[PDB]
Design a protein around this ligand. Structure first.
Ligand SMILES: CC(=O)N[C@@H]1[C@@H](O)[C@H](O)[C@@H](CO)O[C@H]1O
Ligand SMILES: *[C@@H]1O[C@H](CO)[C@@H](O)[C@H](O)[C@H]1NC(C)=O
Ligand SMILES: *[C@@H]1O[C@H](CO)[C@@H](O)[C@H](O)[C@H]1NC(C)=O
Ligand SMILES: *[C@@H]1O[C@H](CO)[C@@H](O)[C@H](O)[C@H]1NC(C)=O
Ligand SMILES: *[C@@H]1O[C@H](CO)[C@@H](O)[C@H](O)[C@H]1NC(C)=O
Ligand SMILES: *[C@@H]1O[C@H](CO)[C@@H](O)[C@H](O)[C@H]1NC(C)=O
Ligand SMILES: *[C@@H]1O[C@H](CO)[C@@H](O)[C@H](O)[C@H]1NC(C)=O
Ligand SMILES: *[C@@H]1O[C@H](CO)[C@@H](O)[C@H](O)[C@H]1NC(C)=O
Ligand SMILES: *[C@@H]1O[C@H](CO)[C@@H](O)[C@H](O)[C@H]1NC(C)=O
Ligand SMILES: *[C@@H]1O[C@H](CO)[C@@H](O)[C@H](O)[C@H]1NC(C)=O
Lengths: 187, 147, 323, 157, 49, 49
């Protein structure tokens, strides 16, 4: 219900900023405070969505209705070509929205937390995630290293090339009512 | 730092790899090799947290509601125990806890050190006077006794 | 001449549960406590990453039988045979057929990332690239057919192509040109029944929807085990941390860890069995595109019910519908 | 085996040598159920890999039955092209088949027309295409240009 | 002309273990204690159904 | 009684289903839906004493 005992800590101000260790009345979780359009009849003040985890909270001070997204996790995948071929930079995956990544590598919010990682220069939003070290190239060769959602990574001009893949090679044969093509030779 | 080491036929460390230097060396500790063929691999960490919100309810902020309760004089009997409601008051514990007034302090579910940090919607005090054997009997279970 | 939908699932969801976020993600005292189970993370994760790696291997074995993409021909009236299945450009803004678009409807961007640690990875072959493939397979079937399977493709007019496919049945090449208008109208009525039948009856639904429901129910089982108690105080993991001071919590979190290991180890084992049931169904569809579509199958009751003339793949979601 | 599973140590003899079999029964049993659930994991993973290889051994059992012993009319099963024959080679834990294919390569355009009209009713080909080179009609099989003189027994009615 | 038996199994037993009766059937205090494992009955039962 | 509840986009209970009313409503709590296609389903209780 609306709470009585505090066991007093000083209450800070809430922020829309991603990744806040939120401590409401009985929720020592962590995540992204974000205002939401959820209705909340006044005798309920925790929101749940499909399962165990609290999705949305009405704030105890200001009665503002806000939903919680978690700290934007995912798996890190890493493209490499041959280490004998090149020890040049393994380009990476963050399976996350990209601006949540770029605004957290310039600060220290990631915790695989690579040290000599002043990269990146390149940023995608391709459905598989967001490549960082890989370069967008408009041409389209063949799938070399699979990524997800139609793009494949490779090792061409020697940088690492990200590109939507061309399926084999585009071809052309002319349908005609009269001409047949039959082989004269075989291999 | 997690840290990979290559030993020799002699049994001497020839080469080492830091796990958190660059994502190539993250991979080398993941597949446990130094010469990796090609492709795409894994590691599953993300997102440490910069800031914290501790914004909890009380907009009235009284203090010490059970300063009356424990040091009250007239406690009733076992059959006619009184439940006293605590309303809108910041109950700071460890005034209660760390100074050992109590022969048997024993929590259930909650624990006394983090009993401060979490809020409660209402707390109730059930105050009555029993026997020393019945100190243990005020508990979940323990049905067959009389208290 | 009747055509028959035969729906074959080739792939499933590429779900990869972030094992540490599932079991205990907001906590870091549990993640230290989870670490002493050795490699029941990172092998659990490596197991159903091997599943996700072969869901595109299943989709390349099926659809990439053709090497070079034959473009969609303009004159689609191939000797009476209508071909409303070969992806027209002006009427549909999307690049998929009218039968394919009727197939993508009869089932069931920025990241969301719910708390439970679950995700669905996107397939490496998009729906528009799968529909590009089956545009090339039908265009190769409508214009070339035969050496199209073997090597490079050789243009044969479609009346000359069908008559050679009657000649595989044993029925002579006389019987086509004697009845070519009647053969074509039985063909064009057949697709018009297929555009009518799989609009309402939900049969091409049936085998694919049983794949999608079986994955979505295996996810909802995995998610509801987070609300399972497993003999702890509460199913909520942060409530165990916030009121038990890490000396009593080590007894109660470990009951909740081994319960959530044994629900992940359950789920990944169920998915490895479903991966075998779909790889066996993708290898069967890899041969049906190899043998019904590219060649003609003397092999009876493999492609169709009757004697088999030809077949056409259609891009279905996580599957193939052969015609 | 080097996993702790909530015991004191992953080494099992160290649990025996310093816990006197009354405290050890609590700590060995945490280490037993961890090593059951790693064997029960492993054997279940191997039973799934056994099915994935029995399905691949039954496919190679047919490829030695049908590509090697016989000739396979079944297309894109043995080889890429039209299949002549195949040869198995002893590979370690596997077979490498050497599928000798046909793959017809060099082609030419040819005007064709079914059922040449000769003396009323036309003549459909007895397995032909009615190829037409420069100012002459012939019949060929449609995987190799071998022009034959058109006769009665090359056609029918 | 010789004929040859080729035997092919097509089905097996349709065993469906009544999960609550297996684990603890005569008891009802165990069935309350079994309930906090979520869906390890009724999914176990749904798997081999 | 076990008891099923349907919430809304608003977040208000629109319809509810008793689990032990009739075996159709036992099914609705079992498959967790209100509009069931066809077929045969499960629940595994029997025989109080
Ligand atoms: C301010 C804003 O809209 N930020 C991002 C946007 O850049 C991104 O494209 C989208 C989905 O990725 O998520 C949000
Ligand atoms: C189709 O075949 C007929 C044969 O009578 C020919 O005259 C015509 O040019 C061909 N092409 C088209 C586009 O009709
Ligand atoms: C086929 O090509 C080969 C070279 O690949 C050539 O030597 C030969 O003369 C050609 N023709 C025939 C009929 O084999
Ligand atoms: C170490 O091993 C190398 C072989 O790699 C051998 O040549 C050398 O003599 C050994 N040295 C010692 C001190 O054992
Ligand atoms: C007390 O609550 C009101 C709304 O109920 C809010 O506007 C006010 O800011 C709160 N007091 C403090 C000190 O925040
Ligand atoms: C009761 O009074 C004593 C002083 O004699 C004090 O130390 C103790 O904290 C009080 N108990 C409470 C507030 O529960
Ligand atoms: C004991 O509790 C009191 C509560 O007033 C507080 O000073 C602190 O938590 C403890 N005191 C010391 C000296 O640790
Ligand atoms: C069937 O035939 C017409 C005429 O050949 C063609 O345009 C189309 O593919 C089909 N008709 C419709 C209405 O789609
Ligand atoms: C045959 O003719 C077509 C169109 O006239 C042309 O595109 C093609 O290159 C020619 N040759 C072959 C071998 O198909
Ligand atoms: C509830 O949602 C409906 C849409 O289903 C909307 O029309 C209506 O305005 C909403 N009412 C309130 C009070 O939010």
């Amino acid at each position: 219900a609306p709470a009585t005992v505090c066991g007093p800590k000083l209450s800070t101000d809430l922020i829309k900023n991603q990744c806040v260790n939120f401590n409401f009345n009985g929720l020592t979780g962590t995540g992204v405070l974000t205002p939401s359009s959820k209705r909340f009849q006044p005798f309920q003040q925790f929101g749940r969505d499909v399962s165990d985890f609290t999705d949305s909270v009405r704030d105890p001070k200001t009665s503002e209705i806000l939903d919680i997204s978690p700290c934007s996790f995912g798996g890190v995948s890493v493209i490499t070509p041959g280490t004998n071929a090149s020890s040049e930079v393994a380009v990476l995956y963050q399976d996350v929205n990209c601006t949540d990544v770029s605004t957290a590598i310039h600060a220290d919010q990631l915790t695989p937390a690579w040290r000599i990682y002043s990269t990146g220069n390149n940023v995608f939003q391709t459905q598989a995630g967001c490549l960082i070290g890989a370069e967008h190239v408009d041409t389209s060769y063949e799938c070399d290293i699979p990524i997800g959602a139609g793009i494949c990574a490779s090792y061409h001009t020697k940088s690492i090339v990200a590109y939507t893949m061309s399926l084999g090679a585009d071809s052309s044969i002319a349908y005609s009512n009269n001409t047949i093509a039959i082989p004269t030779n075989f291999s | 730092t997690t840290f990979m080491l290559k030993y020799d036929e002699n049994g001497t460390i020839t080469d080492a790899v830091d796990c958190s230097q660059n994502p190539l060396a993250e991979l080398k500790c993941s597949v446990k090799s130094f010469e990796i063929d090609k492709g795409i691999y894994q590691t599953s960490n993300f997102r440490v947290v910069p800031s914290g919100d501790v914004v909890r309810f009380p907009n009235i902020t009284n203090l010490c509601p059970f300063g009356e309760v424990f040091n009250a004089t007239k406690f009733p009997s076992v059959y006619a125990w009184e439940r006293k409601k605590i309303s809108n008051c910041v109950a700071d514990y460890s005034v209660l806890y760390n100074s050992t007034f109590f022969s048997t302090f024993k929590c259930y579910g909650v624990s006394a050190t983090k009993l401060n940090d979490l809020c409660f919607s209402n707390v109730y005090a059930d105050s009555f006077v029993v026997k020393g054997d019945d100190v243990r009997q005020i508990a979940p279970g323990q049905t067959g006794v009389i208290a | 001449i009747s055509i028959t939908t035969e729906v074959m699932p080739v792939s499933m969801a590429k779900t990869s549960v972030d094992c540490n976020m599932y079991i205990c993600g907001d906590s870091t005292e549990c993640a230290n406590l989870l670490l002493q189970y050795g490699s029941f993370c990172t092998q659990l994760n490596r197991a159903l990453s091997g599943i996700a790696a072969e869901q595109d291997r299943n989709t390349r074995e099926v659809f990439a039988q053709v090497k070079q993409m034959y473009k969609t021909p303009t004159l689609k009236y191939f000797g009476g045979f209508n071909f409303s299945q070969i992806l027209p450009d002006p009427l549909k803004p999307t690049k998929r057929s009218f039968i394919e678009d009727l197939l993508f409807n009869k089932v069931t961007l920025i990241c969301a990332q719910k708390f439970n640690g679950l995700t669905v990875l996107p397939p490496l072959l998009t729906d528009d690239m799968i529909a590009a493939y089956t545009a090339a397979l039908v265009s190769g079937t409508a214009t070339a057919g035969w050496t199209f399977g073997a090597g490079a493709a050789l243009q044969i007019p479609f009346a000359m192509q069908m008559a050679y496919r009657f000649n595989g049945i044993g029925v002579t090449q006389n019987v086509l040109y004697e009845n070519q208008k009647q053969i074509a109208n039985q063909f064009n009525k057949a697709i018009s029944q297929i555009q009518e039948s799989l609009t309402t009856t939900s049969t091409a639904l049936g085998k694919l929807q049983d794949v999608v429901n079986q994955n979505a129910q295996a996810l909802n089982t995995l998610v509801k085990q987070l609300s399972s108690n497993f003999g702890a105080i509460s199913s909520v993991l942060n409530d165990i941390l916030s009121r038990l001071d890490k000396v009593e919590a080590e007894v109660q979190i470990d009951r909740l860890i081994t319960g959530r290991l044994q629900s992940l180890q359950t789920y990944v084992t169920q998915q490895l069995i479903r991966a075998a049931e779909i790889r066996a169904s993708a290898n069967l569809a890899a041969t049906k595109m190899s043998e019904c579509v590219l060649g003609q199958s003397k092999r009876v009751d493999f492609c169709g019910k009757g004697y088999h003339l030809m077949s056409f793949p259609q891009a279905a979601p996580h599957g193939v519908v052969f015609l | 085996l080097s996993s702790n599973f909530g015991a004191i140590s992953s080494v099992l003899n160290d649990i025996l040598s310093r816990l006197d079999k009354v405290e050890a029964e609590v700590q060995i049993d945490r280490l037993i159920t961890g090593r059951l659930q790693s064997l029960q994991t492993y054997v279940t993973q191997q039973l799934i890999r056994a099915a994935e290889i029995r399905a691949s051994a039954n496919l190679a059992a047919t490829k030695m039955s049908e590509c090697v012993l016989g000739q396979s009319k079944r297309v894109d099963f043995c080889g890429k092209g039209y299949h002549l024959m195949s040869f198995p080679q002893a590979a370690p834990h596997g077979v490498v088949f050497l599928h000798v294919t046909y793959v017809p390569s060099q082609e030419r355009n040819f005007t064709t027309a079914p059922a040449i009209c000769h003396e009323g009713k036309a003549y459909f080909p007895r397995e032909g295409v009615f190829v037409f080179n420069g100012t002459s009609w012939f019949i060929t099989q449609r995987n190799f240009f071998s022009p034959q003189i058109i006769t009665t027994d090359n056609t029918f009615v």
